[PDB]
């Protein structure tokens with residue numbers, strides 16, 4: 294179908310444009326689609342892009358609007374006082390503002406479907422809400438509509454929600470166009486998606502992106518595939534990976550690096566209302582916070598992540614128990630059997646389940662997938678699915694049997710309810726991943742695991758040394774391997790905050806000299822330095838010139854291969870804001886060879902200071918461009934939970950940054 298109205302190049306400069314004569318007499322039937330290409334790089338706090346209203350005295354609550362906020366939220370109002378209807382649908386973090394310093398043309402498609410009684414909004418090719426109602430209100434059927442307006446809503450003769458921006462194209466259709474038709478509308482996106490809702494992971498949500506450039510030129514990414522909304526563990530979360538062989542232009546369909554099967558992989562629309570948004574999958578095992586490195590000697594890619602047993606997350610993990618029993622300088626995974634009140638078993642060499650109360654081996658073994666065998670025979674448990682059909686979250690058996698795993702709620706043998714770290718490897722640069730193995734405990738029997746710093750590990754350029762940063766109360770705990778991740782030792786570095794989420798990322802400034810940048814509780818990013826390949830560490834310093842919130846955000850960091858302004862360069866990615874996870878920046882620092890101090894010379898704003906920017910990953914692509922995969926929303930805010938397709942990827946050149 295062709296549009297009933299089509300207009301373009303409207304400048305919204307805090308003065309509404311009347312298009313009533315052009316549009317109102319063309320509106321007919323109860324279904325409509327609005328397609329709008331617009332820019333707003335300096336928006337007002339709250340502004341309407343498009344309005345249909347009754348402008349008459351006494352009818353201020355009879356209007357339809359498409360509005361946005363300077364937070365990047367998009368929404369509609371559909372109001373008719375005579376019908377007693379006041380619909381307000383919206384989603385935070387749905388917009389782009391600027392890319393490479395130029396205003397972005399957002400493509401908005403709003404579908405008002407009378408037959409299905411559903412209102413659906415897409416922005417930049419992403420569905421941001423779809424709302425079905427019992428009593429449908431057609432948008433041009435509001436009582437006494439007499440104004441069609443761009444850049445405001447006329448209420449009682451006055452301009453409300455005045456806009457700054459521009460509408461480069463606007464079309465309306467007297468039809469609810471199909472999802473397939475929507476997908477054919479040309480986009481002008483500054484970004485691309487690597488992981489997205491409906492892909493092979495079947496997770497509706499993603500968090501904690503990583504990026505790493507492999508020696509072959511393949512660029513690898515990992516991520517938390519989060520099923521139960523965007524909540525951290527306890528939940529169901531798998532670790533997924535995807536790679537690009539063409540400098541980030543296209544990406545492979547994701548596969549899993551680490552996955553559990555005690556709960557079904559379900560694509561679920563997690564509730565965002567205040568009553569239910571804290572619904573949390575409570576009986577599933579999960580992985581969370583992954584990190585990647587490449588090993589030169591073996592050629593293997595190595596991925597670590599935290600592992601959480603069923604119903605466990607950082608909040609309820611036993612802080613006083615590693616989950617391992619120490620014997621002669623050997624650590625063995627403890628197990629508790631159905632009906633016992635103690636952990637009376639251990640897993641020894643070749644996966645043999647051993648009874649500690651009698652010092653006898655049992656007829657149970659644990660295979661390499663941490664699954665339980667009896668007499669070489671695989672035990673199973675019944676899988677769970679989740680649903681909100683009852684009006685609240687229900688987790689219930691679904692009839693499918695899956696291998697019994699010691700991390701599962703329903704297992705005959707269960708691990709200590711605490712957090713662990715696991716590693717897996719790939720021999721084919723991320724086309725497949727091995728079965729994961731648990732790392733041993735590093736801080737003794739009676740201390741829970743450290744928390745892996747998501748992002749990249751560090752492969753020292755001049756040796757086979759691999760380092761993964763982790764954190765715990767009062768220190769960074771660097772995990773060091775010189776034998777392709779076969780064995781690990783820790784190097785502890787005290788930090789002057791307790792209770793910090795001290796997510797740390799490292800760069801090699803030069804041979805054997807490592808600077809680590811990390812999140813703190815002070816509002817400033819901190820750093821420390823090693824000059825002996827991670828054996829020992831300096832005291833902690835802080836970066837001036839970048840602000841974080843009190844709780845802080847992950848920072849990603851790389852050593853750029855090329856000189857900038859004749860100097861060695863480090864690039865940091867972080868929000869720059871004292872208020873929230875917003876104002877994303879790449880900050881370019883030039884190294885002073887005299888003392889290894891860094892001058893933070895260039896700040897590149899990823900998008901508007903008010904638009905969301907949280908965890909991020911950065912990598913130098915083989916062509917010397919910079920790839921950035923980042924959470925484009927405030928992942929701390931309790932108002933921005935459970936958003937789909939907000940982890941996004943962009944390509945930048947150094948000249949863009951400087």
Ligand SMILES: CC(=O)N[C@@H]1[C@@H](O)[C@@H](F)[C@]2(C(=O)O)O[C@H]1[C@@H]([C@H](O)CO)O2
Nearest residue numbers: 501525526581582599607744794928929
């Ligand atoms: C292991 C783990 O929970 N890791 C978590 C991460 O996956 C994040 F989501 C985050 C966070 O957004 O700050 O950091 C922690 C968590 C919170 O601060 C508790 O540390 O929320």
